[PDB]
Amino acid sequence: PLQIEQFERGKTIFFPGDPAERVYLLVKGAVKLSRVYESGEEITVALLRENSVFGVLSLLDRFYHAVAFTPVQLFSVPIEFMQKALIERPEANVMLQGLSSRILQTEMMIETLAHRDMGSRLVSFLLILCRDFGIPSPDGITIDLKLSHQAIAEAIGSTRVTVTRLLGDLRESKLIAIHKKRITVFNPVALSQQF
């Protein structure tokens, strides 16, 4: 019973309103987990990285929306199989060690969406990306993803035009550079203290 899965950029993995059918664990790439509130608002709640489990909380129907933020590989199991499995085997202690990571990541979004100014929200969301997909580069740290202006706009609660003009401003402040949709952040620590 061994298998991986594939999803292109922007493909939702599950919709709100949908059955809570399976429970997934990321293997490569990035997933944008979001929640629809009784208001109808849909807000990013986490950008899950590798070794991240999702679709779990329901177990403990849906009001989350998981989309592939980048191309992703993930292993996935029915909810009733994780539900029986968690009872049978204790070592739940890996699931506790994972749910801490879910909290840590969701808090990292708290700091991103509480910025009120979209520039700081963007910068704060870029830095999440740097820790999670950064590689050292001659200029600085490069986020190794082909990133969409829409995708970012969606995540930070913005419009694409705003996201584009803000990246432009960052570029014209020689704070970042963009080469074939791959963002490079010259000085992460500086940028962070500035916002």
Tell me whether residue 58 is annotated as binding. Answer: yes
Tell me whether residue 100 is annotated as binding. Answer: yes
DSSP H/E element including 82: helix 79-88
41 binds a second copy (CB under 8 A): yes
One residue of 103, 135, 178, 190 binding a second copy per CB under 8 A = 103
Residues 138-157 that bind a second copy (CB under 8 A): 157
Location of structure tokens 């992460």:
188
Cβ of residue 149: shortest distance to a second copy, in angstroms?
20
149 contacts 9 by C-beta, under 8 angstroms: no
Q: Nearest CA to 56 among 103, 10, 111? A: 103
Helix axes of 149-156 and 118-133: crossing angle, nearest 10 degrees:
110
CA distance 34 to 5: 21
Tell me whether residue 190 is annotated as binding. Answer: no
Size of the site for a second copy (CB under 8 A): 36
Interface region with a second copy, contact rule CB under 8 A, candidates 15-23, 77-85, 100-108, 132-140: 100-108
Nearer to a second copy among residue 116 and residue 180 (C-beta): 116
102 binds a second copy (CB under 8 A): yes
Residues sharing a CB contact under 8 Å with residue 42, sequence separation 6 or more, in sequence order: 16, 34, 35, 36, 65
Q: Is the dihedral of CA 71, 72, 78, 82 positive or negative?
A: negative
96 binds a second copy (CB under 8 A): yes
What is the binding site for a second copy (CB under 8 A)? 35, 37-39, 41, 43-45, 56-57, 60, 86-87, 90, 92-93, 95-97, 99-100, 102-104, 106-107, 109-111, 113-114, 116, 157, 192-193, 195
Binding site for a nucleoside 3',5'-cyclic phosphate, residues? 1-102
